[PDB]
Design an enzyme around this catalytic site. Structure first.
Site, mmCIF file in Angstrom:
data_model
loop_
_atom_site.group_PDB
_atom_site.id
_atom_site.type_symbol
_atom_site.label_atom_id
_atom_site.label_comp_id
_atom_site.label_asym_id
_atom_site.label_seq_id
_atom_site.Cartn_x
_atom_site.Cartn_y
_atom_site.Cartn_z
ATOM 1 N N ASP A 238 0.843 -1.196 0.000
ATOM 2 C CA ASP A 238 0.000 0.000 0.000
ATOM 3 C C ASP A 238 0.881 1.250 0.000
ATOM 4 O OD1 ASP A 238 -1.906 1.937 0.321
ATOM 5 O OD2 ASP A 238 -2.450 1.369 2.364
ATOM 6 N N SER B 95 -0.642 15.486 -12.145
ATOM 7 C CA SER B 95 -0.873 15.113 -13.528
ATOM 8 C C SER B 95 -1.137 16.364 -14.360
ATOM 9 C CB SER B 95 -2.074 14.173 -13.602
ATOM 10 O OG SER B 95 -2.471 13.912 -14.932
#
Ligand SMILES: COC(=O)COc1cccc(CN)c1
Ligand SMILES: COC(=O)COc1cccc(CN)c1
Length: 330
Positions: A35, A199
């Site tokens: 994770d 992004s």
């Protein structure tokens, strides 16, 4: 040193991925959920409330000659999906894919929430976010990667998750045969303890690319792709009959639909998520309404590039003095 381990989807939907981890002496192999959005290595154990164990493999520290109770240490964690766990702490030897750390903090669960009990395939979590998020008290502990980093050939790990197939976590090296083209690296902020990046935009299907900054985290422990409501609406508007359902808890779509791809930007590079990766199947057994793999982050507080996005890429988690992320197509 290096390590390399195969990671395997837990079910036919890729709801999560499990990776075998050797703990203790002799080794006890547990299948952990790696994770990158959390920083605790915790396991089902011989100390876990018996009624809260339902098929998981447990760590028994009393059977490990290298286990040592970390005196006074406790841990307690709550995850973004409402699940939680807590317990005490041992140090022990932990190996992943041939890479060994001695003295790793292994957080033994005394209590786990129902969603963990109900998933017999996940024996615990191995956190790979920054150690500032580790919950051990009163002395915070280091992640497996943080402990291994100095010994690794290069201070990196890579995630190569499969679509409906196994994939690989590598530590200490970049397998140049595992991706196509080049790896595009992008800046990371560690201020929230995550692999947080920006992004450069998105496209839906064959549509034009929209240049827009989307800050979010690279999170292997989250199944879906959570993005701003504007982006998510633009995606699902291209699927006839798709709608946001308050009762189901997100966008659903007719199972007869063909889903468009979704592209996200990494600098000037583009990662294409095929439409099929966005199908999470019937909302309940036998339903013709299917659950979408791209969902709004509006109720979270952060955008999350979870497995739906990451499995479309070869992802480098670069733990150099100034961390960065790398993405390649594959
Ligand atoms: C919104 O998040 C999801 O729908 C993730 O679903 C699962 C995550 C882990 C395990 C299972 C089934 N053992 C399902
Ligand atoms: C289904 O699970 C999720 O949606 C996870 O939500 C998060 C919310 C905030 C931060 C993180 C990363 N620690 C995860």
């Amino acid at each position: 040193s290096t390590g390399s381990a195969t990671t395997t989807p837990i079910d036919s939907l890729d709801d999560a991925y499990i990776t075998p981890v050797q703990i203790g002496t002799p080794a006890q192999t547990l299948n952990l959920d790696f994770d990158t959005g959390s920083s605790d290595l915790w396991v089902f154990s011989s100390e876990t409330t018996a009624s809260e164990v339902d098929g998981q493999t447990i760590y028994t520290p009393s059977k490990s000659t290298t286990a040592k109770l970390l005196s006074g240490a406790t841990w307690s964690i709550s995850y973004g999906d409402g699940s939680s766990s807590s317990g005490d702490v041992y140090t022990d030897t932990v190996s992943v894919g041939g890479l060994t750390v001695t003295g790793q903090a292994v957080e033994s669960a005394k209590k786990v929430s129902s969603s963990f009990t109900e998933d017999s395939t996940i024996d615990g979590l191995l956190g790979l976010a920054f150690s500032t998020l580790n919950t051990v008290s009163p002395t915070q502990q280091k992640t497996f990667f943080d402990n291994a980093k100095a010994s690794l050939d290069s201070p990196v790990f890579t995630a190569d998750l499969g679509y409906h197939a196994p994939g690989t976590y590598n530590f200490g090296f970049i397998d140049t045969t595992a991706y196509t083209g080049s790896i595009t690296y992008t800046a990371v902020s560690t201020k929230q303890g995550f692999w947080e990046w920006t992004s450069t935009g998105y496209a839906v299907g064959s549509g034009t690319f929209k240049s827009t900054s989307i800050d979010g985290i690279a999170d292997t422990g989250t199944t879906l792709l959570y993005l701003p409501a504007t982006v998510v609406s633009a995606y699902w508007a291209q699927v006839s009959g798709a709608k946001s359902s308050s009762s189901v808890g997100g966008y659903v779509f007719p199972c007869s639909a063909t889903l468009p791809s979704f592209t996200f930007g990494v600098g000037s590079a583009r990662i294409v998520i095929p439409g099929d990766y966005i199908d999470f199947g019937p909302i309940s057994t036998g339903s013709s309404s299917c659950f979408g793999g791209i969902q709004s982050s509006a109720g979270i507080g952060i955008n999350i590039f979870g497995d739906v996005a990451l499995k479309a890429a070869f992802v480098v988690f670069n733990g150099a003095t100034t961390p960065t992320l790398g993405f390649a197509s594959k």
